[PDB]
């Protein structure tokens, strides 16, 4: 058992667009009319090309600019690379992605793998101040050959005071069975410290967020500081040790929990019941809707 | 020849109070009117289960709720999982703890073990808010089969602005004699973060805070960056190639420090000598008093 | 290309002499000669178990001291009022770093050797925490090797004290140059009251002692983003353009505010013709002009 990632080394290209949203916001979508905050969860394995053809649909300058990925200067996303999309207009950006390996030199060449993000470098100020702030940002992950795969994939960006932009105490709120293996990756914005907690289960604080074996001095956590644009990912198996539940994640500082930054990790026993659980209640005059649907990876 | 931890597995019962203290305050004990700010510290060793059994003293609502153990949703310490406490109410709290080992399916499960802490979730709001301002918070060690023992540990908190609730400039100051193993559990509440720092020592930046030999890349450091619910901890040989003194910790906010965020590591010869240290000075208008004596674990 | 350069076995007893002066602006600095004293202060290089005498003279009207983060000393060099080991105006003192390797102790336990990206600051200007003169720019970089780190070709220092990045005023840089290829060594320290997050555009830096993962066993983090507060310090390098090539290469503080209200810098990788795409040198950026690339820091000789 366990799906583990293949290698990688496929050149792959995907549609990607920036347009309005409600109230005020932008967002990015793999189709006109699609674009989601955060945007499209984008998966790569190790030594994959990636050709984004993007197009613009606001009457507003945005770009796209990436974490941890390899580009050239002329892909950075920004006003000062002269690398940004000006309204109604097409670029095409692309992304690399190398596995590790030793150097002439001896020393060993850290490889594309990790959890990354994308997000506008352009609206609002030279440092994307604007675009952040208007949800333009979203995951993406780069698998190194033999990474564990997951059943599904949610992504939690703490951005200013919101979570994914959404009015405070709306959560999100993620399902699941016990037994599921579920990866979350969790993402900060904007110009705020905070701390991510989830009740009842605990990750390993390294690449994967699973302790490669019993050499792995890593700290064991659940709980974990993090400044904007900071990135991590990990995987549980839900429920496990612990028993099904609405296991609540939140930021960990007292007012930010207070004031909305909460969701449920909704974790059903295999009859689909929850023990202990009140679904369409209102909290702080607020209702947090229907569960979250995982990310599917874009494209190809 | 250190000593070191045994296995796990046994079945261990204490009693738990929640009582009012002195100025608004609350906090933990193990027995009526014994409760500290920090709450009694509870070790445990990987594969123990621990029946708490808590009654709550006080004329309000409280809770008590763990960061990293394994216990079920009825176990969480919430108004939202009904698992809070009545006013002179009683319920016996379950916390469970497992050893590491691969799955089933091929990948490897964390253990328990790490450095902890456990508060209550539900005084002020239904996070917590007011009872951890109030005091009501406590360490958890949980030993992995094989970890080296302490002689003596001391747990610092940074609750908000204060050092374990004390008065600005009051330390706590802790007491060793030079060549002493001595164990630190640094937990960190509320609104602010926080930069814990020890003058003369430092430690490995993994779960135990020791380096587990030549290939251990973990960074060692002197100063860590820490947020609400934060949890980690380390040993040091007091005075190790140093020598005795009176070795400053605090937090390296320079205002936060300023403000009183500070203590003393007070490490003597064997004749008693502690260079660098005035015993009689107050500062800013306040005396750390008498050293605070190392937290016995809590007996079963 | 030949395997990298090392850092030899240390052990042996150093020397420099070190001055406090005072700036203009109403600020302080270390420095190796009257009149010399930078922001931050000359970088200090010794390989494990090599001890330092620092021969240290106060040229200020007012008290200072020399506090030092990871490395062995005494109480009597902690350089605090509390150890009396502070430095009277005009006054001179011996401040004693050591240094050690890792090993085993007789206790079977293995003992962290002292190797780092560390740092040094007043402990005594404006508070009894040195709160006045670490505003003030008294602070440097340490670095400990231990035997067989990899060397780099250069070493830049980077601190973010309050809302500057080496006291220097908003927008202003500084500015580093590398050639693509380079290896580039970043020290990386942060000072004052805030909390910032650490940005580098395009390179990428393991989350561990080295900045480099040690090989294909080495978990840790890869990261291009790191969240740090005062007195944090950690270090890094990278091979400059790796895989991305020549440009102008953006480094600043994350948080949105911080990076729109001038912390940000370049790293500037020049193709081997000296020359770097689509960028221009004479620009102002909201009213000011980071002026020339700052020069890699020599090592105290
Ligand atoms: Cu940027
Ligand atoms: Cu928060
Ligand atoms: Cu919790
Ligand atoms: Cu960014
Ligand atoms: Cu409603
Ligand atoms: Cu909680
Ligand atoms: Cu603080
Ligand atoms: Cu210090
Ligand atoms: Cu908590
Ligand atoms: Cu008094
Ligand atoms: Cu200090
Ligand atoms: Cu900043
Ligand atoms: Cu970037
Ligand atoms: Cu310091
Ligand atoms: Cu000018
Ligand atoms: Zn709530
Ligand atoms: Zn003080
Ligand atoms: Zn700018």
């Known amino acids: 058992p366990a799906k583990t990632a293949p290698a990688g080394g496929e050149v792959k290209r995907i549609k990607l667009y920036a347009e309005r949203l409600g109230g005020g916001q932008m967002g990015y979508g793999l189709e006109k009319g699609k674009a989601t905050i955060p945007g499209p969860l984008i998966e790569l394995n190790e030594g994959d090309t990636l050709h984004i053809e993007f197009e613009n649909t606001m009457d507003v300058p945005v770009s796209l600019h990436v974490h941890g ?26 992304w690399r992605t190398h596995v590790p390996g030793r150097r002439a030199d ?4 850290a ?5 990354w993000h994308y997000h506008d470098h352009v609206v609002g100020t030279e440092h994307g101040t604007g675009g952040i702030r208007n949800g333009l940002y979203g995951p993406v992950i780069v698998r190194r050959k033999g990474d564990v795969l997951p ?14 932009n959404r009015p405070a105490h709306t959560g999100p ?10 990866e979350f990756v969790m993402i900060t914005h904007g110009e705020y410290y905070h701390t991510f907690h989830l009740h009842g289960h605990r990750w390993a604080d390294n690449r994967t967020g699973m302790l490669t074996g019993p050499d792995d001095p890593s700290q064991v ?26 296991w609540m994640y939140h930021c960990h500082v007292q007012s930010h929990s207070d004031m909305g930054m909460v969701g449920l990790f909704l974790v059903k026993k295999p009859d689909g019941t929850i023990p202990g659980y009140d679904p369409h209640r209102h909290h702080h005059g607020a209702a947090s809707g229907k569960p979250e649907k995982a990310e599917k990876p874009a494209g190809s």
């Open 173 to 182: 709120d993620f399902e699941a069975t016990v037994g599921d293996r579920v």
């Open 221 to 246: 956590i659940d709980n974990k500081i993090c400044g904007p644009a900071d990135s991590f990912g990990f995987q549980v198996i839900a429920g496990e040790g612990v028993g099904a539940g609405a």
């Open 111 to 115: 490889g594309s793998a990790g959890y």
């Open 106 to 109: 001896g020393t060993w060449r």
């Open 151 to 164: 059943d599904r994939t949610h992504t939690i960006v703490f951005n200013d005071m919101t979570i994914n």
């Open 69 to 94: 990925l390899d580009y050239e200067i002329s892909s950075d996303g920004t006003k000062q690379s002269r690398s940004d999309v000006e309204p109604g207009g097409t670029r095409t950006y692309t």
